Amino acid sequence: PKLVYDIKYFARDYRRNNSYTVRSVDSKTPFDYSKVFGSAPLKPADVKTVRIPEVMPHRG
Amino acid sequence: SSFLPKEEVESRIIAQVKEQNLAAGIKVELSSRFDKDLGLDSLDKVELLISLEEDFGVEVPDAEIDKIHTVEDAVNFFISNPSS
Amino acid sequence: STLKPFDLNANNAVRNGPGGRSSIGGVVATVFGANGFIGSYVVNEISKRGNQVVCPYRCNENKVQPLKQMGDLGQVVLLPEFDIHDDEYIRRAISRSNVVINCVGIRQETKNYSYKDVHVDFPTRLAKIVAESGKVERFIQVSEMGADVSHASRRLQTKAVGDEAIMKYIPDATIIRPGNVVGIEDYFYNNLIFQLSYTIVAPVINNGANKVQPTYILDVADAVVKILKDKKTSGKTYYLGGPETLTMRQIYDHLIDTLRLSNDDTVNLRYELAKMLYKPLDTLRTKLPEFPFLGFMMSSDYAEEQVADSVAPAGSLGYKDLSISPAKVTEGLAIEGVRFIRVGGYD
Amino acid sequence: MKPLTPSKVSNFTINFGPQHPAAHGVLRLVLEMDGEIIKRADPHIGLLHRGTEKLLEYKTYNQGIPYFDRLDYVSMMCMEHSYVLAIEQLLNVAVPLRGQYIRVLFSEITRIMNHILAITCHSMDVGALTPFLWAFEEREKLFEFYERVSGARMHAAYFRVGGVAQDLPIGLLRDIYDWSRQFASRVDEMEELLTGNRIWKERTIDVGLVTAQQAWDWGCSGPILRGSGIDWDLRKNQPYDVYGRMDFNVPIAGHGDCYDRYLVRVQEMRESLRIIYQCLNEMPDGLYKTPDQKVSPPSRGQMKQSMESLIHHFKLFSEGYHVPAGETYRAVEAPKGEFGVYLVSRGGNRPYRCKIRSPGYAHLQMLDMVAKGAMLADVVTIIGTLDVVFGEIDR
Amino acid sequence: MTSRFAYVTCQKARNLYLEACRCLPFIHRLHKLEEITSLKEMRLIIKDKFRVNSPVTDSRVTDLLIFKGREELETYLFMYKQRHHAITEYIEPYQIKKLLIERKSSNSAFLDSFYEKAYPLVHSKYA
Amino acid sequence: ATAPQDFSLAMKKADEIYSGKTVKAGDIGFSAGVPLETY
Amino acid sequence: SYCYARKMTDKDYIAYDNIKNFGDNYLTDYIIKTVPKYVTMAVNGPAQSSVLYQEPTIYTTPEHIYALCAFLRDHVNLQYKTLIDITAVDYPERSARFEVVYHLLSPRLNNRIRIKVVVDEVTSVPSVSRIWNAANWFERETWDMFGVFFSNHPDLRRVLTDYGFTGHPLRKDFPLTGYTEVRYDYGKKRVISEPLELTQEFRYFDFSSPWDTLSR
Amino acid sequence: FKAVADVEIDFSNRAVLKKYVGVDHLSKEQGTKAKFIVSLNSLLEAVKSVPETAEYRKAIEATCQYRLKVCGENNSDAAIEEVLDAHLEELIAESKEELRILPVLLESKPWDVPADYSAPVFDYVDASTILDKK
């Protein structure tokens, strides 16, 4: 354990370091359907898959 | 159109009207509005009509309850109806 | 309505709370005969209001089970070994008690205990023990209406002698004298019903002429509470008769009506005959233990007390002085218990 | 000028009261029946409503974990798991791998006990009593593991925010492994007696039929989905611990009847045994609770030797940690379905709102649709397959 | 088909009360209350139950109150509540009130509460 | 005093977007269903 | 749509890349652009599905809730076939006290969405039972606990609380212990309800620190 | 997945699979490619009622065009199932389910909004992103 003699919580403080940003969305600007369906496979070969996350985050 | 004697039904209805707390004292006769002469509330009017339901074995329409206003109107309604 | 205090000295200091089960009432009570029909309701009334009730009982855990529920933790104290002849136990029972209620009585004689013991000796000894203490402020004794020194029945005579002894030792004691008490666990309607239904013939002494004033158990319990809430009641005897006076024939007829019996099963066992049929059977009782087969009804004492009119004297204290309106025992909730059996639409 | 045709009327509004050979708990069920056939079923609940959700609002986060153990007395670990996962998400706390493994292991163990109780109590409701007694010895063997790790056989309160309450006692892994060597044989013994039995087949086949559309419409989860042909498992579709590493196959049936769900539950027991074996072999070494001491208590020697650890111990056992303002809904694949907690935090040391999503609430709602056209005897079987726990239904 | 001769809710609570009065005999028979109480006796209690909520004037609050009162009626009508519930909550207090004898207190309202308890807002049991 | 810049942002924004309908004083207390002696 | 078992082996994937992307980052913008009248504001936050991802929260008004739910269930791209639960949260500081929360699952998208309708005590929320049959009991519970009326509900009745209960317990103004207590009386052989008395009062321990900053 | 039936059946038959998992409950029709094409074209005809410059209509047009393309290159009906991650029967039911809500969307017309409509969006930033690096 490298935390015995090296104590710095502010570097390892994730609880109080979260924040929320703000955006405004409007109906005038059209949605980008190129992003949604341009990357979509058209054949079985082009299919790409997301693997299941093996472990949840841990500090080690 | 009076199926039963006018005197009997009027005497019976005023007998039931006397049973209510108020609606008495100096004026218990004809030509007495339930809400404008006798101090009765609408719920008290409905309960008196239900008591007449028990007395005379005959139902009253709810729209007729909207139409009835006086002691004359109730006795006319009960005399008119053949089941009485 | 405004809650009235229990008129006990220094109650104002100890009392606190709304007056409920978890509240503190400044009344510690020793109710003798708690497991009985009358005693259980008195215990319920006293303990319901947050007071502590000490209940001496002859060893019987199943009989005193309802008293456990009556009060909050530590409020109903059940003392295991009660003997009417043990002075030291009586002193221990009333050690912390500021009111004592005596409901101990026997309907019938046995070999171990006679009327003269329970109804005379126990009241006198308990009266002396309460008098010597001084902490006890209120004493209430429950007796029958018909109890009189010049009474043919031995039970009602011994009860009156014991009441006079109590009045002598404690002058400020109150003698509660209810009529035939009607209840779910009563011995009036239950015995009449058992007579009408599981007995070959229902013997009625004379023709039911004797008049009675039955009262509901809740009314007597409330009257006890009103006695304890007034100190002016001390030293007075209250004849807690019912609202209506009825002859026994009317009560029998109305039980037959409510139960919808096919016909009248009652027979005329006139007096001077019960006095010959039951006279040896009393001597039989005095030499044998308690037996369910025969009891109470089948005694000369019952016949002697059913030939007189057990009604309140005209000039007398009653429910009106306690500001209680007694409920009718022939209608309403009082009559539900017999009503549940059969009403002719039932079974 | 063509005659009209009249119809028939239904009566017999029976009251089916609390009844012992049924799903455990108290059920008051009002059934309107045309003859021997049910036309409406209206379950009356609230007989075990203890006001759990409002009590949580008056307690600190660590003080409220035993509530979740007692929400479902059959499956404790899975119930507390969702609560601790939601608090961890709001707190942004990372669990060490050993604690994650211990959570997965004990979740599978409680899943197995839940399935044992479900199958054998369902068989008892049918009327076969031997599997029931044959199963209690296994369930005792698993309760002894619980009593070893936590000191309580039922309400362990072992799962904590950031890990587990205590470390695994020495010698535990061997005993669990022995129980695993014999579990498959015990399950086969039970399966032979139940599966293939003509009376059991007749009693359970084509009873309580549910279709995939109906299951999604009524919000059902777990064995009800998988008995109808739905390849949906939270442990695979939405992994929440080292479940992603674990290798196991979803059991699928298609009919949706009672028999299919019984077969699914047996196969789930086998899959849980496989997951336990993988956990045993791959169990890591190291910390079992999070290193952060502003959300987890320090060890006792450490508090007795360090000032900062005594301060943290005092402020965690008196005030508790402060959870940042936010909302989260975390769900776990409980043995009875999907159990989720909707936690609302305003930034204090107590939850502002803790909604509990009952898997059995939606199943009991589905009871009426499922138990249409059935008989008085079929109600017990239909209740058995739903496997409803009324302390879990009534929070 | 035409000739010139041819063609020539402020009270929602009243309707709810009418429903209660009309449904009263059914709950009397369903709850075995014939002997204990009369129809008129219950009709008297129902009016007081309605009158407790008189001050409200908003239509929406009135709607909510009517819906809740309909729920209260439906509990008895559908046998959710039992005979002892009806005895305890309606019939017994009304009969107790009729049987009550009280001495007209010469002390004013303030004096009686002062004698009774220090904090009048706290309730009293078994008064 | 500047800004929390966290979930409280969306909390306040939800506050300002929405509003409650005006009712007469005390009417809601009857809807609450608690004993009237509470008030 | 319905996650009918299709692939017998090698279905190790959590989902396809495109399905994840469309819902990881385009979902809120897609909803707002497609059905703008229904949406008033949107929040992206910590995920319900997992710790690492992000799922939308949409605030809509009570009048538009039925159409928004119908759109969410049956839209080809967004198929929220499941209603996980319906919940209300009481905020006494706000004029519109109650926030009715709807939780949905899309099996096809492997995604969770949260829908909030902010109302007050007098206003009502249209029932969504026709969209999801599971709503009936959830709305009955919300009516019981918080007192939120749901319009056009087939039969709105209390579920959890005792018969004759008139108060709504989960309201922040309701006492934790309530107002009444239940006891059996010996005199009247009935179980009766009485005003509350506590042998030991509930002890509220005020642990708040002046120095804390997380409290909002 | 694992079948819970002791009986041995072949799951590569692509019909025994569908019978086992109960797709027949969803639709008694076989669900061939031509039915999928017809359903997509019928959805395209239906969405004509929605105004031309409506974002919902553009979305439905794009999705239907994408699936008609996926039908185009893939001559095998199973290949379409693999690309679209669904059985053909449920793919066909999808367009009908889309059809059911067109009346409800044409009654309220969500697409009508003023030219100044603005929906505030709040986004969550994780502390793990900032703390590890920037």
Ligand SMILES: NC(=O)C1=CN([C@@H]2O[C@H](COP(=O)(O)OP(=O)(O)OC[C@H]3O[C@@H](n4cnc5c(N)ncnc54)[C@H](OP(=O)(O)O)[C@@H]3O)[C@@H](O)[C@H]2O)C=CC1
């Ligand atoms: N009809 C009535 O109920 C009326 C009653 N009364 C009077 O009230 C008193 C009691 O009423 P009730 O309760 O009906 O009578 P019960 O017999 O029902 O109660 C008698 C009580 O006295 C106890 N007891 C009797 N003898 C002894 C004894 N020798 N040693 C110790 N305890 C004893 C009994 O305990 P155990 O159970 O162990 O015997 C029982 O608890 C009687 O005096 C009766 O005359 C007044 C008017 C009418």
Ligand SMILES: CCCCCCCCCCCC(=O)SCCNC(=O)CCNC(=O)[C@H](O)C(C)(C)COP(=O)(O)O
């Ligand atoms: C055993 C089963 C018993 C069932 C018990 C049911 C008890 C239900 C109690 C519910 C009480 C309500 O609904 S209260 C209904 C809402 N309360 C209001 O005050 C609205 C308007 N009020 C008035 O007009 C007058 O006060 C009024 C005196 C009502 C005159 O009635 P009318 O409007 O006609 O004029």
